[PDB]
Each structure stands twice: as C-alpha cells, then as structure tokens.
Amino acid sequence: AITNREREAVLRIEFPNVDVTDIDFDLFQARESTDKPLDVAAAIAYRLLLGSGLPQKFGCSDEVLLNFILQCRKKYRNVPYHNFYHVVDVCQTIYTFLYRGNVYEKLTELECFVLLITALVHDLDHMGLNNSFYLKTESPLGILSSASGNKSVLEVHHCNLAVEILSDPESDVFGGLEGAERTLAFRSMIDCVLATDMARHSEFLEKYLELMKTSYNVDDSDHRQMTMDVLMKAGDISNVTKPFDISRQWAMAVTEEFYRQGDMEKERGVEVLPMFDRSKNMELAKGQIGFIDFVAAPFFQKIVDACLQGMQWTVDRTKSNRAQWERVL
Numbered sequence: 001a002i003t004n005r006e007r008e009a010v011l012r013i014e015f016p017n018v019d020v021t022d023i024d025f026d027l028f029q030a031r032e033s034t035d036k037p038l039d040v041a042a043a044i045a046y047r048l049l050l051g052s053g054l055p056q057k058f059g060c061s062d063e064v065l066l067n068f069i070l071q072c073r074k075k076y077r078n079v080p081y082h083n084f085y086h087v088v089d090v091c092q093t094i095y096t097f098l099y100r101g102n103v104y105e106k107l108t109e110l111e112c113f114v115l116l117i118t119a120l121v122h123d124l125d126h127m128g129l130n131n132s133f134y135l136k137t138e139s140p141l142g143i144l145s146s147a148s149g150n151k152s153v154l155e156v157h158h159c160n161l162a163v164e165i166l167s168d169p170e171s172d173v174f175g176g177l178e179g180a181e182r183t184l185a186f187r188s189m190i191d192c193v194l195a196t197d198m199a200r201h202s203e204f205l206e207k208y209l210e211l212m213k214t215s216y217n218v219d220d221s222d223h224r225q226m227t228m229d230v231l232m233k234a235g236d237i238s239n240v241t242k243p244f245d246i247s248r249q250w251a252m253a254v255t256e257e258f259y260r261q262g263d264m265e266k267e268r269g270v271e272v273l274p275m276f277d278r279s280k281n282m283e284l285a286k287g288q289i290g291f292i293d294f295v296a297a298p299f300f301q302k303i304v305d306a307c308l309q310g311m312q313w314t315v316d317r318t319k320s321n322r323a324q325w326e327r328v329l
C-alpha cells in the first residue's frame, strides 16, 4: 500500500504554464526544475491521464489511478535509462501519437486508455541489463525463461509485475471494466508489452505492414492489436523523434546504462558487444546514426506510409537529428 504523504506529494503538483500534451514537451527540464523529480514524473502521468478524460470513462477513480502510478514507480530502479522517467516519457509520447498524430481514429477509446496504462508498466523492474545478459550468465530470470520456453526474459517479467499491481483492487485501473472489456484490457496490455522485445522488431513490423496491404478493419481484432503493438514499439524507439537537445540527453542515458552492462560482462568473463564497451570508445553520434539507419528511420517511414499518415513529423525529426549527429562527427 501507499502512504498518504507519498500520494499528497504527487497530488499537489500542477502544470498550468507547461503543456504536457505537446510534441515539444521536455521531461529533462521538468525533472531538472524541481527538487522532487520522481513526484513531478508521477504527476505528469497522473495529470496527463486525468486531463484526457479516459480513466473517468472506464470507471477508474482518481485514487486508483494515483495508487497505480505510485505502485508502478516503486518497481522502477535507479538505472541511467530504464528508470521511471523512461516509462513516463513513453506514456507522454504515445499520447502525442494518439491525439496529435490522429492515431486515436484507428483505435477504440478503451484501447487508447489501455495503451497509456501499458506504457507505464512496459519496463517494470528493469535492472539496466538486456535479455541477452540473463541468458549468457544463466541468471535465475534467464533460467526461468529457458525452462518455461518464453525467450523474452524481461518482457514476461514486466507482464508478471503488471498483473501483480493490477491484482490489488486499490490499484486496479481496469477494475471498473467487465466481461469482454476487461479481458481485452489485460490481453492487449500483455500483447503490447511482449511486442517490445527488440529481438522481435522485424517480426512485429512485417506482421503489421502485411495486414495493412488491405483496407484497415477496426472490426478485426488483429488489425487493432497490431496497431497497439506498433504504437507501443514506436513510443519505445521514439527518443530519435524528439528535439536534438532532448534526443541527445536520452542518447547519453542509454550509453551509460549500456556501458555499465558491458563492465559487468567484463567482470563475469562473458562476451561483450562493441556497443556495451566503456573503456574502448565509440562516438555517441556513430551509435545514434547506426540506430536511426538500420532501425528507427525504416520503422517510422514504413508505418507512416502504410497507414499512420498523421505521424509524418516522426520521420522528419529523426532525419533532422541524423543530420545533426553527422555534423557532431
């Protein structure tokens, strides 16, 4: 359970002069301009969701929504990248895809609510170590994954914790739903989180594009779910689509986390990939350009051209940042 000092420390935060729905929203400045960045991060998610009118529409009370965010926050660790700020950022970004990029037209209101909730649970208890680390080192979570036959080590873990938070009525944001609606809420959340495993990036992207070769059918379960998966994925690789100052700060965070993994691998005598090598050094610009060219740019370009036409700015900003990193070299 949550303490009343904890709830009130978040409840009292308001943003009258800072628009949390904007594509230019700067979470780094929001964090840096307070002495309580975890409270401000929780208030951004809370006010963003209450402001939309979605929780209220699905019988999710203000207290339950606030309890849920705080339970999620407790399960986020002090790591450079996969910390609470990342999921608040993903939530805020998906919101912009839905309501600034008009993707809300392609999904039901319930599915928009589920997506925003899912963003907040999608990396629960991440240790700043990737799936490969768990498998190479034969860690208890890796062993658990191998024996159960589910290769997405962290993603299954993220789902288990989401289901656990939601098992408590005081934090069940889906507690106000019933029957088909409730099943859809859990099924869609679980499928979205499982879709975030990057070892399955091209699988999800190509399953989506083939479904969109024919007319978009909202009556089709697969069409909606694949759209939900693509938006969760887009939120996850969205740091490339932000203003250069913001994009650079996420680039530095992911670099430091990756380097800490590499250092732990060196200490354990397991294989280290160049991307995770701290002592030897690669320019930040090079990492980002490679990331954009082989992953981020084709992803955004293909989904935009296939169906998500309103998300054109994501393609534009990624290119502008790619050009800026090229200048850095």
Ligand SMILES: O=C1NCCN1CCOc1cc(C2=NN(C3CCCCCC3)C(=O)[C@@H]3CC=CC[C@H]23)ccc1OCCO
Pocket: 196, 198, 236, 237, 239, 240, 247, 248, 250, 251, 254, 255, 258, 275, 284, 285, 286, 287, 288, 291, 295
């Ligand atoms: O500049 C850099 N320094 C070292 C790495 N590097 C370039 C990579 O940068 C980023 C990578 C990531 C993620 N990489 N990968 C993998 C995806 C396939 C391609 C290779 C990299 C690993 C994950 O599995 C993470 C978890 C889920 C979604 C994306 C996450 C996130 C954010 C990144 O940059 C933030 C500013 O745009």
Ligand SMILES: [Mg+2]
Pocket: 122, 123, 154, 196
């Ligand atoms: Mg993840």
Ligand SMILES: [Zn+2]
Pocket: 086, 090, 122, 123, 196, 236
């Ligand atoms: Zn993530």
